[PDB]
């Protein structure tokens, strides 16, 4: 129970109706005081899994963890840096680039993709 830490509960909007294959919405059981998920177009109902139904924003989403596929390492127009040793593989020749995207946000922080095998590992400095 501390100010410091993190919170990534893994949002859920994919457990659609199994009976007619359509989207599920939250709904109340006032009798059991429990969340349920129902398809609007049929009588099908099923109990929930988490008390969360919706979230919005998450500050500076470092979303560096995804999107950037390892294959980016092949592009000849991207710079090869002699700065060395992928932290995983015992090999230098990292490929790097800044940020990209309209949510380049404002950081100028380099993102590094090793190009050697024995990893395919992504990291920032």
């Amino acid at each position: 129970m501390e100010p410091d830490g993190t919170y990534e509960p893994g949002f859920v909007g994919i457990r659609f109706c199994q009976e007619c294959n359509n989207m599920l919405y939250p709904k109340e059981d006032k009798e059991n005081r429990i969340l349920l998920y129902a398809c609007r177009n049929c009588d099908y109902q099923q109990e929930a899994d988490n008390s969360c139904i919706y979230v919005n924003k998450i500050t500076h989403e470092v979303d560096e963890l995804t999107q950037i596929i390892a294959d980016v390492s092949q592009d000849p127009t991207l710079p090869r840096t002699e700065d060395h040793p992928c932290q995983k593989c015992g090999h230098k020749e990292a490929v790097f680039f800044q940020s990209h995207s309209a949510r380049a946000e404002d950081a100028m922080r380099l993102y590094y993709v090793c190009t050697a095998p024995h990893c395919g590992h992504r990291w920032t400095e």
Partner: protein, 152 residues
């Protein structure tokens, strides 16, 4: 013109109808902090829980207090918006919001003219209004705008 939207890191909506057994076990002592807060109509207030997280850095610049924000929103919306807040003794800052209803009249007479949209869905409209329209120390409409200059 600082809107609550500028200060806010994130928002979340939970179904937590039992504060005494809240969905975030770590949040549980603050509920202990609030039981004297209208304990009779907790059977009457809605079970949907709104939870907000705030940026410490925005909060420092605007040099605000959590009680200033709580008093701003309660004053802005009205008595319906039941607010409680976390302890100042943390680097993080979070605010927990429930909605109170009209109490006595909700006995389902004809059909309760609301057309029975879910109260949560009403809560998202609350959060929408809450982000865009709330103007803590945002005394006007000067976009976001400023800068300060020293002239010699």
């Amino acid at each position: 013109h600082t809107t609550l939207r500028k200060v806010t890191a994130n928002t979340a909506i939970y179904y937590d109808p039992n504060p005494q057994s809240t969905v975030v076990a770590e949040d549980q002592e603050w509920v202990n902090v609030y039981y004297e807060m209208p304990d009779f109509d907790v059977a009457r207030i809605s079970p949907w829980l709104l939870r907000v997280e705030l940026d410490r850095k925005h909060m420092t610049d605007r040099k605000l207090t959590m009680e200033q924000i709580a008093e701003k929103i309660n004053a802005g919306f009205g008595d319906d918006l039941n607010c409680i807040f976390n302890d100042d003794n943390a680097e993080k800052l979070v605010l927990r919001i429930r909605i109170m209803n009209s109490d006595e009249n909700k006995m389902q007479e004809e059909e309760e003219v609301v057309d029975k949209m879910d109260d949560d869905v009403f809560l998202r409209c609350i959060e929408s209004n809450m982000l865009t329209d709330m103007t803590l120390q945002g005394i006007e409409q000067i976009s976001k705008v400023y800068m300060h200059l020293p002239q010699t």
